[PDB]
Design a protein around this nucleic acid. Structure first.
Ligand SMILES: [Mg+2]
Ligand SMILES: [Mg+2]
Ligand SMILES: [Mg+2]
Ligand SMILES: [Mg+2]
Ligand SMILES: [Mg+2]
Ligand SMILES: [Mg+2]
Length: 224
RNA sequence: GGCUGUCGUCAGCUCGUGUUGUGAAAUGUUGGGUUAAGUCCCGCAACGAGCGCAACCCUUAUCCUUUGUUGCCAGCGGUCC
C-alpha cells in the first residue's frame, strides 16, 4: 500500500473532535474544521506490519475471520473474504459466536440441514406454509451464519472493520486469545486490538482498500 | 402414597452454554410492534432448549363415496288408506 493511495481513498479522515477517544492521540495528526485527521505516517507502517503478520497466518494454513457489519462494509467484507477463501460475518455479530461456539455450531449444523432440504426436494412433502417457515429459518441462518458455515472451528485471526462497532467480537477474541487486526477510527478504543490500524472505517473507498490488501496478502500467504 | 380442589385454561415457569456482577443475582424472558397466547415479526450479549400456548383427539355445521335393515318413500302398480 502507498500513502497517496490511502489519502485519495480518504483513509486520513477521522471523526469529529468532540467524539475522539483520547487513547487515539498518538495516531492523530491534527484537526481540520473540528474533525480529527489521522496520521498516515503511522497508518502505513502499522498496516504493513499487520499485513505481514496476516500473511504469516495465512501461510501456516490459518483461518481469518473478516468481521464488518456496518452497512457500508457488509458487501465489501463478504466479497473480500470470499475472494481469498476465508470466512466472514457481515451481518449482526451474534453474542457468543466464538466464546459459545459449542452452541452456535449447532445452528450452523441446522443451516447445513436446511440447505440440503432446500436442494433435496424434502420441502415438497411440506404443508406449503411450513416450506415458507423453513425457508425463513434457512434465510435468517444464512444472514447470520452463512459466512462461517465451513469455518469448522475457532479462527486463528480476526480482521475487524470499526473496532468500536465490533467491540463484542473483539472482546470474544481477547477472551479466547485470538489475535485481532482492526481498523481503529479516531472515536474508537484500540485497547483490545493486537494489530491496530488507525484509519477511517466509514467510507467504502477506504474499507475496500483495506480489504483488498488483506485479501491479497492472505492469498499470497496461501500461494506461498 | 394415591387421588382431588384452588389460584387458573391465567400466560406464564425454567434450564444448558455464553456473557455481566466481589456477590445475592442478571441477561436470555427486556425493547418496537402484534396476538387469545413468552402468538408472531423486527431488534438485541446472547445462542439455544424444555414445560406450558397452539396443533394432533371427541363433538357440531356443508358435501362426496360405500352399504341399504329393523331405518327411507321420489318415480311406477296395487290397496283393507
Ligand atoms: Mg416471567
Ligand atoms: Mg430474569
Ligand atoms: Mg416489547
Ligand atoms: Mg412458546
Ligand atoms: Mg428477545
Ligand atoms: Mg392446547
Amino acid at each position: 500500500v502507498s500513502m497517496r493511495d490511502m489519502l485519495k481513498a480518504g483513509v486520513h479522515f477521522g471523526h469529529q473532535t468532540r467524539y475522539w477517544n483520547p487513547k487515539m492521540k498518538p495516531f492523530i495528526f491534527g484537526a481540520r474544521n473540528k474533525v480529527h485527521i489521522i496520521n498516515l505516517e503511522k497508518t502505513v507502517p502499522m498496516f504493513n506490519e499487520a499485513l505481514a503478520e496476516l500473511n504469516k497466518i495465512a501461510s501456516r494454513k490459518g483461518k481469518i475471520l473478516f468481521v464488518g457489519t456496518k452497512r457500508a462494509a457488509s458487501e465489501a467484507v463478504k466479497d473480500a473474504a470470499l475472494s481469498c477463501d476465508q470466512f466472514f460475518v457481515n451481518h449482526r455479530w451474534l453474542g457468543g459466536m466464538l466464546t459459545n461456539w459449542k452452541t452456535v455450531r449447532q445452528s450452523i449444523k441446522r443451516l447445513k440441514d436446511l440447505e440440503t432440504q432446500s436442494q433435496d426436494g424434502t420441502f415438497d412433502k411440506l404443508t406449503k406454509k411450513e416450506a415458507l417457515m423453513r425457508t425463513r429459518e434457512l434465510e435468517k441462518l444464512e444472514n447470520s451464519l452463512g459466512g462461517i458455515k465451513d469455518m469448522g472451528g475457532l479462527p486463528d485471526a480476526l480482521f475487524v472493520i470499526d473496532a468500536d462497532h465490533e467491540h463484542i467480537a473483539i472482546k470474544e477474541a481477547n477472551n479466547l486469545g485470538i489475535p485481532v487486526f482492526a481498523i481503529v477510527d479516531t472515536n474508537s478504543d484500540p485497547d483490545g486490538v493486537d494489530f491496530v490500524i488507525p484509519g477511517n472505517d466509514d467510507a467504502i473507498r477506504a474499507v475496500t482498500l483495506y480489504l483488498g490488501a488483506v485479501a491479497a496478502t492472505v492469498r499470497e500467504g496461501r500461494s506461498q
